[PDB]
Amino acid sequence: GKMFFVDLSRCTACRGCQIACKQWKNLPAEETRNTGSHQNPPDLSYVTLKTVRFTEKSRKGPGIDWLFFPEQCRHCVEPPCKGQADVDLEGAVVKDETTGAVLFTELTAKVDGESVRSACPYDIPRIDPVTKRLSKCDMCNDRVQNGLLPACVKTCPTGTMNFGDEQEMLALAEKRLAEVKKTYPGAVLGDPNDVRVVYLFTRDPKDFYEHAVA
Amino acid sequence: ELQKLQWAKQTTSICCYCAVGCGLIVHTAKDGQGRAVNVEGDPDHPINEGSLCPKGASIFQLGENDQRGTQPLYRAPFSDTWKPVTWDFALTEIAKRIKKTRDASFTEKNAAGDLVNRTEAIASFGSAAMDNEECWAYGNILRSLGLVYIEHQARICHSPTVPALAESFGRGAMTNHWNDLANSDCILIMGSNAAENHPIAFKWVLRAKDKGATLIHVDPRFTRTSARCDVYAPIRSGADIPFLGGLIKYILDNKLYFTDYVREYTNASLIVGEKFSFKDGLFSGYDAANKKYDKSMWAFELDANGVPKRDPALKHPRCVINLLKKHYERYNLDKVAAITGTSKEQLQQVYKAYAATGKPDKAGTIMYAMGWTQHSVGVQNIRAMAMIQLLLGNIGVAGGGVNALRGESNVQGSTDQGLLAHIWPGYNPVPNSKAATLELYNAATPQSKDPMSVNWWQNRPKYVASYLKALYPDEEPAAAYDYLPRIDAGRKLTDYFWLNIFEKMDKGEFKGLFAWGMNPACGGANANKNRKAMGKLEWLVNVNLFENETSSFWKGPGMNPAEIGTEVFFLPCCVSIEKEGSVANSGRWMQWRYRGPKPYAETKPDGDIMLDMFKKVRELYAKEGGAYPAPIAKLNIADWEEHNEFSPTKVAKLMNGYFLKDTEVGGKQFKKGQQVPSFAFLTADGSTCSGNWLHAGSFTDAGNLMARRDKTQTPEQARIGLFPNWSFCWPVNRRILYNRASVDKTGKPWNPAKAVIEWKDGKWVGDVVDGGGDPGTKHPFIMQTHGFGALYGPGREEGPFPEHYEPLECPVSKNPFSKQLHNPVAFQIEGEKKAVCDPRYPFIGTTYRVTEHWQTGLMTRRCAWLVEAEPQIFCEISKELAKLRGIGNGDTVKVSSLRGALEAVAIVTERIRPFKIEGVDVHMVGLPWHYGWMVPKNGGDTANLLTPSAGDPNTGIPETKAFMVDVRKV
Ligand SMILES: Nc1nc2c(c(=O)[nH]1)N[C@H]1C(S)=C(S)[C@@H](COP(=O)(O)OP(=O)(O)OC[C@H]3O[C@@H](n4cnc5c(=O)[nH]c(N)nc54)[C@H](O)[C@@H]3O)O[C@H]1N2
Ligand SMILES: Nc1nc2c(c(=O)[nH]1)N[C@H]1C(S)=C(S)[C@@H](COP(=O)(O)OP(=O)(O)OC[C@H]3O[C@@H](n4cnc5c(=O)[nH]c(N)nc54)[C@H](O)[C@@H]3O)O[C@H]1N2
Ligand code: SF4
Ligand code: SF4
Ligand code: SF4
Ligand code: SF4
Ligand SMILES: [S]
Ligand SMILES: [W+6]
Question: Which residues bind [4Fe-4S] cluster 2 (chain A) (predicted)?
């Protein structure tokens, strides 16, 4: 299968990835307002498959730790969302056995969406309140199948977003972690044996987002 | 295949936003409407490698936008609605308004009786967003009409950079390029938010860190840049010179300077004359009456040949290096800490990390932009860092240099084409009234009797002659010289610049304004004046993508359309991806881009709009005569046109230039019609034309070098990533300027592992050598008269050394360095008030950008995905100031200055802290200037309602980065 390695030690929160997702899929924009944060949209939704979360952590000296988290479906190796959807109707949630992509179909309309969202340890699924379809990042399975990078991976200027075969991405993740620790001694990989989107966090993953790891 | 791209043609383009110059791939629906279906990165482009920030990644939404202008619109005087009209009506009537205004206002001779052949009744603004060929054509169209009031983005952006670096090194441009950042050992980002405003640049910043580089951010705010840096230090807005003056003192005390570089390649050794002095914030030769200095008092001591004397032992007390040591003695860490708000520990940490690059085989670079330029001391801010870089020997080396990060996609280009009041294309000055002949014009260029000084500007007569041949090929240069308008020698240059154009407009002195690809209603400092002043225009021509705050200033806030006489023409233009041409990026890479989609609706490329407009004016003069027609009638526009329309290729070939006759030059022989292979082969006798001598070498007999997509490199080139076969850069493809300073007197790199050039056998390998000659035979700064990096620079309006002056609105009442609080020659408009320690406006005000929006947001406020991320004007304040004023995070606040007020959403953040200035906490208020009243709903208006119409006495840049404000909860 395929894997993302997301090295957040290089993230500038440019939100290139957030826009590139919407441009590639031609997704609509949400109605947003500033409530005292750069973060927007404030959450994933049925029309937002990726948003960059902003968190300010206090640091004694002049500056802070500003933690950036471009959130997406982890495309779990053994996905609980599928386990839960398959009790109501197989085919609502399927696995691409070549890429590893976990894919919601239009049949998610005819399953307990509430229950499927609850099954996700990363709180990823979002429901269309009209159609009751579940939507999330689809790994740009489209592009990967046609030998292209996912839109958010290609657009990323910093080397945060990396993508390829699971063996080369796991090897990259271990080599990068050792280098990153010289600058960020508390750096860790997010649930690396269970998911296909392996985030490198510079510190406590829960400071990035409460569901950053299981 | 992928359904979305299955029936679309692929074309390459270059991003229409920042001066990084990222490559695009455009997918266009094969037939029918012929619209773009997809825009994303070019994976083969050597700068971005397929990556795009959110502005670039959303170009599809900009291009295929249902709010874009469709056809010309006309607003009759006193009317409250637009009327759709034909291009025929629009261009015909504008041509009549130009002719009518030109005929009534045209001046052959000024009051002094000197020939000036100009109209002072029409001004033009824009644009760095046009192609290089359009910028060049536009300037020459305006100048053939006799305009002198010609300005664009550069005035209010990097205008201070040009004289700051020209004084220091000989040229005004970014010294290195984006890819080169990866070679640096220490990256200082200061007066810059590069992770937000040049995002793809951070690819190369982080690759430098991968190889052991220290990343330093110095900024009043903790930003998305600060988040990735090793060292963050706060600095108070307007306190840059103390910080930099402190580093000079630190370098000199601790002997961290590159001794051999300083001795051989800087003016350290030059003997300053006896008339130079400084005491209590004032240099010698101060004339208080006229608010200017007698710069003659700063002259060097010359030998009998007129060559400045040099003490190679650096012992003479009037040696530049000894006067330098004496000047910055006052900038001790305690005084610098007290005035900056930066702790002595933080200053020392930055100083030690950066000044470590004084070692020959270590390179330090500065990345700076508007945080340094947009001040009353903008030029001196940059001078101080230029001087630091010369002391450490960081100029001319890979991973070194002064990286002045240019703003718009083609602001480098638009400045190169002379869309500023003081310069023709290629930085040949606009003649003044006393330059009565081409001979006298050419007499002004200083000569050097030093056999090691190249003094390349001595070739100017070839460039001016070749420029006049490009415009007027049937006239002798000395005759065509009389066709072009001249400015008054008697006046300060700032009389002809942006802020004084708006002051004159406010007093009714302008009939006509071209707002051509600019939004001065939002982008100009003190915006309320600009909005009122445009009310005093008889006619306004706005050329842009969308209806906007400038096009529709007459139906703006507190305006009565019924009472506003201004006739307005809105002409809708094509987006970047709908046209062909070149754009020059920050590293001077002139990159060719192609048409993907057809023009939207009835929109036109600027090239076609300006050419058909000029043709109508020309045909009106051919029919009914009028004022001095020769410059209009005789202009060579045949070379601009192919198949009845603007020809970027033909214009680009004229800007490069060609032989008007069989010619022998530099030992070689050329047939009439051949392209000029470089500016080395231009002549002063009329044999050659060249629209811009910098472009000579860009489009030769070999083809369009700007269109080269060749990433192959020699091993030497590949070690530092010159990519010399990717597009073309002026001058003659020298990718790192001043690169003779990167080697010793035998031609051996200071840092062989990162060699820019090297002498091998009997030739320079690597980059193109910046100045011909064997090793050790030439001073390395060939565009300088004397040939040296200028530590002491006596050409600058407020002195040959940077000196701390407070912003014109400042939070302190006493300068700790002198008894001069403000720049003693600052550009100010008499009667305009400033809040100097005014209790009504106790907070520092500054303006800046976010990643997701562009300029006034005219473009990005129309793009739903960018609005999504940043929907509303905000106000960033500390928790300390939030508590003082009882403001909660997310509350509506009112920010006010002497000049206006607006409402914004409070962002209360630990990313801002108080500045402890002389032991007292000073609070700041930060605002994005990206918002305007037209769109979106609840977006807010421009931060420029608050900014002052005062600033730098060298370039007249407004002080939009340091003023004084109040903030109240609403
Ligand atoms: N996202 C985005 N990118 C852009 C643009 C845009 O609108 N949006 N516009 C482009 C253009 S035209 C330009 S010229 C460039 C400009 O790019 P920048 O110069 O990076 O732009 P700013 O954000 O205006 O200013 C940079 C930083 O200066 C800091 N600052 C404020 N006052 C001072 C001061 O007195 N001293 C110092 N040292 N720092 C200070 C601010 O806090 C800010 O973080 O960006 C270009 N790229
Ligand atoms: N307070 C404050 N004020 C500032 C600044 C600041 O930092 N603070 N920054 C200053 C700087 S660095 C700059 S450069 C100025 C910019 O000030 P302006 O140039 O007035 O800004 P915009 O009009 O928003 O941006 C350029 C325009 O180019 C247009 N455009 C795009 N493509 C084309 C094209 O093909 N043809 C034509 N004709 N137009 C086109 C866009 O639609 C847009 O309207 O603002 C300055 N003002
Ligand atoms: S594009 Fe890359 S650097 Fe920018 S926010 Fe997304 S992951 Fe971070
Ligand atoms: S992250 Fe959640 S939605 Fe995505 S595959 Fe795993 S369980 Fe399913
Ligand atoms: S992989 Fe594709 S669908 Fe998932 S976040 Fe990235 S661009 Fe969006
Ligand atoms: S705005 Fe600048 S960094 Fe972003 S894609 Fe365009 S050129 Fe590249
Ligand atoms: S700019
Ligand atoms: W700019």
Answer: 21, 137, 140, 152
Closest by CA to A58, choosing from B190, B337, B220, B913, is B913
Which residue intervals of chain B bear CATH 2.40.40.20?
843-969
Using CB atoms, which residue from A23, A28, A41 is nearest to B58? A23
**Which experimental method was this entry solved with?**
X-ray
Identify whether the C-beta of residue B114 lies closer than 8 Å to the C-beta of residue B434. Answer: yes
Query: Which protein residues have a CB closer than 5 Å to ligand 8 (ion)?
Result: B 157, 407
Question: Do the chains contact at B872 and A34, CB–CB below 8 Å?
Answer: yes
Residue of B193, B204, B865, B905 to mutate when probing chain A, most A C-beta within 10 A: B865
Tokens of residue B428, six digits: 């040949």
How big is chain B, counted in residues?
970
Kindly determine whether residue B43 and residue A41, on different chains, have CB atoms separated by under 8 Å: no
Q: Spelled out in words, what is the top-level CATH class assigned to the domain B175-405?
A: alpha beta
Q: What is the resolution of this structure in A?
A: 1.8
Residue B199: which of A14, A68, A183 has the nearest Cβ?
A: A14
Q: Which residues contact B783 (CB under 8 A, 6 or more apart)?
A: B166, B169, B170, B171, B456, B457
**Among all chains, which residue has been given the structure tokens 């240069």?**
B477
Max Cα separation, chain B? 78
Close Cβ partners of B716 (under 8 Å, ≥ 6 residues apart): B755, B758, B765, B766
Helix (H, G, I), strand (E, B), or coil: what is residue A1? coil
CA B744 to chain CA mean position, Å: 32
Residue bearing tokens 């230039």: B657
Q: Give the CATH fold of the B3-67 domain.
A: Phosphorylase Kinase; domain 1 (3.30.200)
The CATH 3.30.200.210 portion of chain B extends over 3-67
Q: Tell me how far CA of residue B116 lies from CA of B98, B106, B328, B481, B483, in angstroms.
A: 19, 10, 44, 11, 9
Cβ atoms of A157 and A16 within 8 Å: the answer is: yes
Task: Tell me the CATH class for B843-969.
Answer: mainly beta
Q: Give B167 to chain A, closest Cα distance, Å.
A: 35
Token pair of B503 as six digits: 């002051």
* Closest CA relative to residue A17, chosen from A155, A164, A124, A198: A155
Q: Which amino acid, B240?
A: D
Q: In order of start, what are the domains of chain A with their CATH numbers? A: 2-74+143-208 (3.30.70.20), 80-138 (3.30.70.20)
Length of chain A: 214
The helix or strand, by DSSP H or E, that contains position B633, with its residue range, turns out to be helix B630-633
Q: Residue B462, SS3? A: helix
Q: Which two tokens stand for residue B497?
A: 């610049």
Q: Report CB contact under 8 Å: B907, A63.
A: no
